[PDB]
Each structure stands twice: as structure tokens, then as C-alpha cells.
Write a protein that binds this ligand. Structure first.
Ligand SMILES: [Br-]
Lengths: 155, 228
């Protein structure tokens, strides 16, 4: 919207107090920009856990997708934000959501070398046999990157 | 892990300005663009307008010409982000683009900060375009493919180079290749880290604004680095 634009900006800027103010004054929790990015995408992106929680409490869609196929879990997994991965999963994030290239959060987390995030994704039923559109599983990726520790838990 | 002086400037959302002065087979035109980029997300949001009237070439032919400093780089690769690390004083970007069975563009651009805004100023020259053909004849579809590009250090020239092919879709199912030869050099004169070779992956969506009378293009992009 308008109140929605303010909210997208405050979320991305990591201004927690502004977000709370906007939310209690009735801002649209599921506002999005032209890319389909929601405030929850943005707070997960920058790793602001308290904001992620506030937004979930006020009815944020945990599975909102941008036009590139990114959910907030994709962005949190890619950027290495473990507690945010945990909370998104607990409150219903689709662990096997595919972006445009067929990448699941497990692929993104494996590509960036984020071991603890991979362990949590697996705990929540991440598919080790899912292929992206270059035909690569997360396991194949970890081998390409020479990462013993990921290869061992992804086999 | 590393955060260079120039990387510090891209932690937030950054306003963008693009100015292009063009000449193709003698047809003069100008394009201006505005919007913003978010290098942490890896996204661009831009709107471009032809200020001279009607664009004498297809908009898709201009996309590569109209700021790779907005690519998202993983933490382990931040020391390889030449583009952001050249800021604020910026870099020169030079291309020759050969359209197969048709003419070519030559571009020179300066990308740098002017105040708080990242500004791409371009000169473009096109020649030897068939009046019949896909470009001047405007037979390109209004869309854009996803492309990976391989970024290479060039020690001898103290910069980087990129040689890539763009596939433009034509009305009747066929495809028009555009071979890009790119060279980038810092404007600063100090010592500079040249990157290890790696890739940029670009996705692009072209659209129109419902309320814009002028010849324009809305361009959204999503860009990530990989391969180290
Ligand atoms: Br910001």
C-alpha cells in the first residue's frame, strides 16, 4: 500500500521498534513490493529474529513466494540464519519449496556451506534426492564444493 | 567475512540512476532510468524511459547495457566482488555486442556513486544494422532469458573481462545471438584485488507500467554469484 511500503522499508532496514508501531497501528502484514517480497522475506533476509516473530504473530504468510520462487526460508537458509530457519519451520514453512532453478532451501544452504542449517532442514524432512534443473542434489553440490562434513550427512 | 570500503555502501537499499546517450545507424535517442537495488537480497527494480520519443531498437537489446555491483555474493566470496570494491569512485565498463547476421553496439559506461545514488552513465554507438532485420525491424519478443556469465581477471589490463552470448527470442520461434565482449577497469588509481574467476547468474523480468504513455521498460532482476 502506503502503510505497506513503510513496513517493507522498516523491516529491511532492521528498525524493530518501527515495525511494532506499524503492526499495532494495523499495517498489512502481507504487503509486498513488485518482486513479491513481503516484510517476512526481508526480516528473514537480514536475520532479525524478533521481527520475524512479531510478523508471524500478526498473521504473516510463512510460505509467501517472490517472483523468483524465493520463500523466506530460502533466504534465511541461504544467508545462514539458524534460529530463523528453526522458527519458520516450526510455524509451517515448506521445507521442500523449489525456486525457479529448482533449488530447495537444502540446496542453497549446502551451496553456502551452512552445516547446522542443513542438519535442521533434514530433521524437518528435507529431500536429499531432490534435483535442481542442472540435475544436482544437495549432496552432489557438497561434493562439487569439496565439503566432507556436508557430504557425510547429505549422502 | 571481509567488508571493503565499497561493500559498506551496499548494506542497505541503494537508489539507482541510469542515463544512456545512443546512436544506432544514425538514429539518435536517449534513455533515462530510476529505481533501486538491494545487493543483500540480490535484486534490481528499475524503470527506463525513452525521452526522445520512440526507441529505434528493441528494449531487450539494451538490458545488458542499462550495474553488476548489485549482485549478491556469499560470505566466503566477498573478497572477489570487484564491482562493489571499486566504489565509491567506481569503474569503466566497455562492451562490443555483435548481433549475428546484423550490426553491432559499442558501449562505454562509468558506474560510480554521486552522493548516495549509484549512477550508470552510458554512451552507445550502433552500426551496420540491416533495416530489414530483427533489431531495426523490431522482431524481438518482449522478454528475457536467464543467463550465467563467467567473470575473469585480466592482470595485464588491471581489470576483468567477460565474454558471453545472449539469446534473444524472435517472433517466429527462432533466436538472435548477441556476442558480448566486456572489459571493466577501476577509475581509482590505487592497488586493487582482482577476483578469482567465478560466475554471475541473472534472472530478468520485463513488463510495462499501465499508466505510462511514453516508450518505457520496467525491469526487475535477481542476481547471485557462485563458483568458489
Ligand atoms: Br535499507
Amino acid at each position: 500500500s502506503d502503510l505497506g511500503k513503510k513496513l517493507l522499508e522498516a523491516a529491511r532496514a532492521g528498525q524493530d521498534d518501527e515495525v511494532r508501531i506499524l503492526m499495532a497501528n494495523g499495517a498489512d502484514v502481507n504487503a509486498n513490493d513488485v518482486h513479491g517480497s513481503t516484510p517476512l522475506h526481508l526480516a528473514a533476509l537480514i536475520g532479525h529474529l524478533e521481527i520475524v516473530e512479531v510478523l508471524l504473530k500478526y498473521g504473516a504468510d510463512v510460505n509467501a513466494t517472490d517472483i523468483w520462487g524465493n520463500t523466506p526460508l530460502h533466504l534465511a537458509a541461504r544467508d545462514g540464519h539458524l534460529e530463523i530457519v528453526e522458527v519458520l519451520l516450526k510455524y509451517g514453512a515448506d521445507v521442500n519449496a523449489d525456486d525457479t532453478w529448482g533449488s530447495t532451501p537444502l540446496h542453497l544452504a549446502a551451496m553456502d556451506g551452512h552445516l547446522e542449517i542443513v542438519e535442521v532442514l533434514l530433521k524437518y524432512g528435507a529431500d536429499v534426492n531432490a534435483q535442481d534443473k542442472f540435475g544436482k542434489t544437495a549432496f552432489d553440490i557438497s561434493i562439487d564444493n569439496g565439503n566432507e562434513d556436508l557430504a557425510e550427512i547429505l549422502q | 567475512s571481509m567488508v571493503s570500503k565499497g561493500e559498506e555502501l551496499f548494506t542497505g537499499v541503494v537508489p539507482i540512476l541510469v542515463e544512456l546517450d545512443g546512436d544506432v545507424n544514425g538514429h539518435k535517442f536517449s534513455v533515462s532510468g530510476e529505481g533501486e537495488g538491494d545487493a543483500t537480497y540480490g535484486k534490481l527494480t528499475l524503470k527506463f524511459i525513452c525521452t526522445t520519443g520512440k526507441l529505434p531498437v528493441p528494449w531487450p537489446t539494451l538490458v545488458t547495457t542499462l550495474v553488476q555491483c548489485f549482485s549478491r555474493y556469499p560470505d566466503h566470496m566477498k573478497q572477489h566482488d570487484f564491482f562493489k570494491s571499486a566504489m565509491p569512485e567506481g569503474y569503466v565498463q566497455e562492451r562490443t555486442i555483435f548481433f549475428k547476421d546484423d550490426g553491432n553496439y559499442k558501449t562505454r559506461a562509468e558506474v560510480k556513486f554521486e552522493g548516495d545514488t549509484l549512477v550508470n552513465r552510458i554512451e552507445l554507438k550502433g552500426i551496420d544494422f540491416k533495416e530489414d532485420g530483427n533489431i531495426l525491424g523490431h522482431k524481438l519478443e518482449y522478454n528475457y532469458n536467464s543467463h550465467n556469465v563467467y567473470i575473469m581477471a585480466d592482470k595485464q589490463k588491471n581489470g576483468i573481462k567477460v565474454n558471453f552470448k545472449i539469446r534473444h527470442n524472435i517472433e517466429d520461434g527462432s533466436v538472435q545471438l548477441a556476442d558480448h565482449y566486456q572489459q571493466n577497469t577501476p577509475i581509482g588509481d590505487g592497488p586493487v584485488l582482482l577476483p578469482d574467476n567465478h560466475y554471475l547468474s541473472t534472472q530478468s523480468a520485463l513488463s510495462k507500467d499501465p499508466n505510462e504513455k511514453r516508450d518505457h521498460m520496467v525491469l526487475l532482476e535477481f542476481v547471485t554469484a557462485a563458483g568458489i
